[PDB]
Design a protein around this nucleic acid. Structure first.
Ligand SMILES: [Mg+2]
Ligand SMILES: [Mg+2]
Ligand SMILES: [Mg+2]
Ligand SMILES: [Mg+2]
Ligand SMILES: [Mg+2]
Ligand SMILES: [Mg+2]
Ligand SMILES: [Mg+2]
Ligand SMILES: [Mg+2]
Ligand SMILES: [Mg+2]
Ligand SMILES: [Mg+2]
Ligand SMILES: [Mg+2]
Ligand SMILES: [Mg+2]
Ligand SMILES: [Mg+2]
Ligand SMILES: [Mg+2]
Ligand SMILES: [Mg+2]
Ligand SMILES: [Mg+2]
Ligand SMILES: [Mg+2]
Ligand SMILES: [Mg+2]
Lengths: 208, 50, 62, 300, 167, 158
RNA sequence: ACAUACGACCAUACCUAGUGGAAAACUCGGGAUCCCGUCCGCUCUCCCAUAGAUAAGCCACUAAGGGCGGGGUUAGUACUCAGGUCGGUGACGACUGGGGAAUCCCCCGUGUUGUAUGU
RNA sequence: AGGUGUCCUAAGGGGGGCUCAUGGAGAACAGAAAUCUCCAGUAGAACAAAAGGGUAAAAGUCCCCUUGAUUUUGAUUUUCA
RNA sequence: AAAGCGAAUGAUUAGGGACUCGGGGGCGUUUAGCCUUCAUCCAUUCUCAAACUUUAAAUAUGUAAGAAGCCCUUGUUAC
């Protein structure tokens, strides 16, 4: 199978992405990052909660997949399959090698074993956006999923509105001012620096 | 001691422990003193001290 | 058996032991590598200048 | 369907060329070699006889290159041949030769070597270059300038070489060969000289006039209407150009006044300022933006 | 009102893409030469033409362009065969147009079995006076957006001058 | 591994972003004299007369002037000694140096200061002094009332 | 001040779209004998400066224009030099004496200038 | 991660005319792709060969002429004592 | 180092807006008829690079801080 994750916990070298120099890399274990009702509008899911790293370490794609599965199962069974949107925000781009045992330490450069995500202190690992009535469900889902990760993780309720980078109050006032238009599952903001006619026809309620 | 602080202490004439010198405060001297901070204690002398 | 490959560990201290010698500059540098046409003209210019300086003491009085 | 090539990234990464190259006016590859002086010659100027052609004029300039811009040593135009008697065909080979001669005499007079270096007084088609002149101080080399044709093609019989020949006969040493003068035969590598004399004195124009008058009188009248109005005949062109050369050598600084309206520099400045449109201010642009917003909203 | 914007025929380029070199291509060049009054030129193949077994640098086509009254009359003779009837697809968004004749002998040329039967492709490129701004060597520059031709303008010009029909 | 002439010059010898193509001609229009102090900066578009990558970013003295190049004297630190190196560099890689402009402006400023001081009867200060500690002064809080600051409580911003 | 020629910096100058342009210049323009060159006088070359037109080139202005340039904000943040028998199992972090960024985002601007001859 | 023991009378030298990869429209056979035309097109092509620099009225491409791939001996640069 | 990828190259997660078709498949057949499933395009979006980069530090590094200098006048030369 694979070595225990203890052996590849700390980032003791330069990144080694898969590329034209590093061919033969197995596919990452995690392939799906968005789950739940990912088509929901911004207004549907105002509450956002983040599972955030508290350490500078390497997270394996297998661990990311396992945590995704656990959190998704809890959220689906409790908040409903259409009551949340879960986004894994850590991508395992760094390829970890193995020197499978000419013999000894001669020619010790290893072959690619797997893939791993390098995370920092304060880096968001998982995000969940949902209705304000699902706060406890989201917190519990993140707390349960954190058991699949090495190191310390924190659950932080975002002060922003959903996945937008705007606080609740400023998002609400910007939307009331007609400065926000609805895109697919996200929003776009008026800039007052483009073509005047195009801006008027894209944000009609902002010029009343 | 690293060579740059060693050279700066030699130029300040503080070649031995518990050596003391009077320095006129300018930018040029202040930067040298800042570099050799891990080896010196300095301050503002009064008339009694002088 | 295997041994150490290379090192620059002590080289800076060895170099600074007796100072880094910088060859002293001189008033008249060597004309080596200067344009040969310029050198050929400069030879005769110096010849004429010395001749004129000697005639100045001997009666030219420039 | 169609990937948009000229997007913001393309505009951001676009590197503009030199302004003169965008305008299509300067060949910097040729300019480098034209103006670069050997470093061990220091501040010795490299003189360019630059020649340019407009629809109605020939511009000839003696130019030096400085670090912050070129300096015009002297300038001669086909405008000024009206002061010497030429009033038609101001952009032909004879006019090119005449203006080259005028510029050569002007430069020699400016730098004080006009009494010596007379060039050839009576032009002919012989290929010659201005040699050194004898004087009381011994041998003196002629003033040197190199031709600057710009973007014009250097084919055989070109008016750039006409101006060059004019200046060379005027007395400036211009290093050149003869295999581009009109009348040079490439197949035998010989210069006829008589075709060159004809072109210098404008005889090709006269022969065209004669052929047109013999064959197609309507086209002859349409083409040479001004010649008919000034009753300038084909046979008189040679003597007219010879007299123009004589007058140019006699007085290279004769002043020509045009028929265009004339004012002072300040008067022209005021008149030009009268038609200058001013830029809108920031508040004016903001007010226009609000007005457009209101108009568009009222539309819908 | 249009002072100096009248549409003129810049050129008429007509070509025969035979597909193979040899005697037939030479005969195509011959018929084009006798049609135009000028010696045509051959076009190489740029890539591996598996269609007619060509790899590179082989003559597969011949063409020639004409200008002025000769171009006007040749293009008129071509639309004699086409009956002044063209589809709207034939007009490019720039303002040029063109059409193909399946055989050249319906033009003002007598049949000769020694040279054969060839069709050919006509393409008329339009212009307005002042296009030299974009083709001269010195001070080369673009033409203004208002001065370039429109497909609708070319269609209208064709309809007016040749009384033709566009479907 | 390799030790070729231009090894490791991927960025140093490259031309900057939006700096490619035509070379400005003031480079060729500059003039140099023996004894001039010049900065060496390799132009990647001119492969003739290229100095070695060591001399890129070095400042030296012109000792020879030629048709299209200058000879520059540099001092290179090898082991425990300095070696005088003489490099032939084409003009495109050579720039006049401002390394002496402050001194060259100070010498004439001092000359005028000397003649003016002699005329006016009072000596002036010719040598530059280092920055000195600030003198005593009074700061009025009239219409400049101090604003009291306190450390802010911690809160999350994500 | 405007135009032209030769430039310097080489987008504040580029790219797109619209409107206007005194005088002169520039331009488009007309002809194809000669010099010259093309499949084609398209380009290049020659001849005309009459005629026509500012339609285009060119110039100016416009655009909550794209880009570019400058400034702010990001932020004393990220980072980093030196220090401690500092904390922490560790990962790493804080502090002491110093230096100190870059996006997003916001605001402003859209060429300056030399020589010569002219209007 | 790769490359070299070669290859070139031009793929060396000089000059000039031209502008490439690609895309959008169009034209009998002809289409996804053959040729022709126009418009966009900062190089996204090409430059013997690895990779990295560099190059647009060229360093690319085509055309014309050539043998500076010549003779003589020094100076200098890198690897370096 | 940091930073960036609604900036080039390369890697990569998600939905939207339309195109008319661009491929396929259909419904009431040269009907630009009306649908659909992908693809392209577009303005957005999550996350990255030892052999990517528009930017870009700290540390460290080249040169200079006069008498062999500066100012004025005019002597030599075959360059
Ligand atoms: Mg075990
Ligand atoms: Mg051994
Ligand atoms: Mg050993
Ligand atoms: Mg000793
Ligand atoms: Mg040239
Ligand atoms: Mg190897
Ligand atoms: Mg080559
Ligand atoms: Mg060659
Ligand atoms: Mg060549
Ligand atoms: Mg060339
Ligand atoms: Mg490149
Ligand atoms: Mg020969
Ligand atoms: Mg980094
Ligand atoms: Mg990217
Ligand atoms: Mg990318
Ligand atoms: Mg890096
Ligand atoms: Mg720095
Ligand atoms: Mg420094």
């Amino acid at each position: 199978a694979r070595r225990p994750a203890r052996c590849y916990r700390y980032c003791k070298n330069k990144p080694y992405p898969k590329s034209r120099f590093n061919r033969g890399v197995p596919d990452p274990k995690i392939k799906i990052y968005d789950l739940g009702r990912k088509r929901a509008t911004v207004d549907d899911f105002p509450l956002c909660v983040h599972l955030v790293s508290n350490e500078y370490e390497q997270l394996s794609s297998e661990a990311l997949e396992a945590a995704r599965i656990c959190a998704n199962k809890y959220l689906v069974k409790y908040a409903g399959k259409e009551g949340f949107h879960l986004r894994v925000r850590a991508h395992p781009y760094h390829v970890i090698r193995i020197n499978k045992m000419q013999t000894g330490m001669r020619g010790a450069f290893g072959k690619p074993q797997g893939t791993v995500a390098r995370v920092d202190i304060g880096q968001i690992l998982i995000s969940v956006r949902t209705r304000d009535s699902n706060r406890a469900i989201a917190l519990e889902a993140l707390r349960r999923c954190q058991y699949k990760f090495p190191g310390r993780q924190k659950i932080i309720v975002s002060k922003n509105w959903g996945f937008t980078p705007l606080r609740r109050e400023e998002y609400l006032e910007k939307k009331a001012a007609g400065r926000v238009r609805v895109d697919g599952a996200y929003v776009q903001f008026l800039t007052n620096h483009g073509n005047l006619e195009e801006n008027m026809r894209r944000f009609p309620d902002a010029f009343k | 001691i690293p060579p740059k602080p060693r050279k700066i202490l030699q130029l300040l004439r503080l070649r031995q422990i518990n050596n003391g010198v009077f320095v006129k405060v300018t930018k040029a001297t202040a930067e040298m003193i800042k570099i050799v901070e891990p080896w010196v204690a300095y301050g503002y002398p009064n008339l009694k001290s002088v | 058996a295997k041994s150490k490959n290379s090192s620059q560990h002590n080289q800076s201290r060895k170099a600074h032991r007796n100072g880094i010698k910088k060859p002293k500059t001189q008033r008249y540098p060597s004309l080596k590598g200067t344009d040969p046409k310029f050198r050929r003209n400069h030879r005769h210019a110096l010849h004429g200048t010395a001749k004129a300086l000697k005639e100045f003491k001997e009666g030219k009085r420039e | 369907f169609h990937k948009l090539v000229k997007n913001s990234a393309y505009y951001s990464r676009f590197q503009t060329k030199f302004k003169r190259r965008r305008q299509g006016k300067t060949d910097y590859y040729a300019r480098k070699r034209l103006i670069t002086q050997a470093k061990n010659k220091y501040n010795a100027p490299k003189y360019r006889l630059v020649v340019r052609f407009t629809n109605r004029d020939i511009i000839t300039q003696m130019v030096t290159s400085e670090i912050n811009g070129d300096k015009i040593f002297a300038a001669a135009y086909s405008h000024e041949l009206r002061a010497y008697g030429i009033n038609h065909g101001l952009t032909n080979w004879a006019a090119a030769y005449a203006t080259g001669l005028l510029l050569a005499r002007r430069v020699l007079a400016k730098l004080g070597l006009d009494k010596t270096f007379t060039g050839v007084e009576e032009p002919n088609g012989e290929y010659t270059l201005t040699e050194a002149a004898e004087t009381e101080d011994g041998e003196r080399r002629p003033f040197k300038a190199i031709l600057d044709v710009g973007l014009a093609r250097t084919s055989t019989g070109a008016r750039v070489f006409g101006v060059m020949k004019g200046a060379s006969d005027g007395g400036i040493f211009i290093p050149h060969s003869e295999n581009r003068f009109p009348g040079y035969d490439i197949e035998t590598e010989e210069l006829d000289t008589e075709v060159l004399k004809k072109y210098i004195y404008g005889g090709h124009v006269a022969e065209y006039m004669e052929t047109l008058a013999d064959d197609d009188e309507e086209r002859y009248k349409s083409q040479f209407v001004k010649y008919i109005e000034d009753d300038v005949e084909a046979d008189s062109l040679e003597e007219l150009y010879a007299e123009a050369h004589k007058q140019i050598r006699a007085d290279p600084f004769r002043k020509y006044v045009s028929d265009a309206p004339k004012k002072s520099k300040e008067e022209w400045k005021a008149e030009s300022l009268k038609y200058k449109k001013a830029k809108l201010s920031r508040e004016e642009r903001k007010a226009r933006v609000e007005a457009k917003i209101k108009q568009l909203l009222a539309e819908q | 009102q249009n002072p100096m914007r009248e549409l003129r025929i810049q050129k008429l380029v007509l070509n025969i893409s035979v597909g193979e070199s040899g005697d037939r291509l030479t005969r195509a060049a011959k018929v084009l030469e006798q049609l135009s009054g000028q010696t045509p030129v051959y076009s190489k193949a740029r890539y591996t033409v598996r269609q007619f077994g060509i790899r590179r640098n082989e003559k597969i086509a011949v063409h020639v362009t004409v200008r002025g009254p000769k171009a006007e009359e040749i293009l008129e003779r071509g639309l004699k065969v086409k009956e002044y009837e063209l589809r709207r697809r034939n007009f490019s968004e720039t303002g040029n147009f063109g059409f193909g004749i399946s055989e050249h002998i319906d033009l003002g040329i007598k049949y000769d079995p020694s040279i054969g039967i060839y069709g050919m492709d006509f393409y008329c490129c339009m212009t307005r006076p002042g296009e030299r701004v974009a083709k001269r060597r010195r001070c080369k520059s673009r033409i203004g957006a208002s001065h370039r031709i429109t497909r609708e303008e070319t269609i209208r010009w064709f309809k007016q001058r040749f009384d033709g029909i566009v479907r | 591994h390799a030790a070729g002439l231009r090894s490791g010059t991927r960025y140093a010898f490259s031309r900057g972003f939006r700096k490619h193509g035509q070379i400005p001609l003031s480079t060729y229009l500059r003039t140099y004299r023996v004894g001039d102090i010049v900065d060496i900066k390799v132009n990647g578009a001119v492969q003739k007369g290229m100095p070695h990558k060591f001399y890129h970013g070095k400042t030296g003295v012109v000792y020879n002037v030629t048709k299209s190049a200058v000879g520059v004297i540099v001092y290179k630190r090898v082991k425990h000694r300095y070696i005088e190196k003489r490099i032939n560099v084409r003009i495109e890689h050579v720039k006049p140096s401002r390394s002496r402009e402050d001194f060259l402006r100070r010498v004439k400023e001092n000359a005028e200061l000397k003649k003016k001081a002699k005329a006016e009867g009072v000596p002036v200060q010719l040598k530059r002094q280092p920055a000195m500690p600030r003198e005593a002064h009074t700061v009025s809080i009239a219409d400049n009332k101090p604003v009291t600051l306190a450390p802010v409580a911690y809160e999350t911003t994500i």
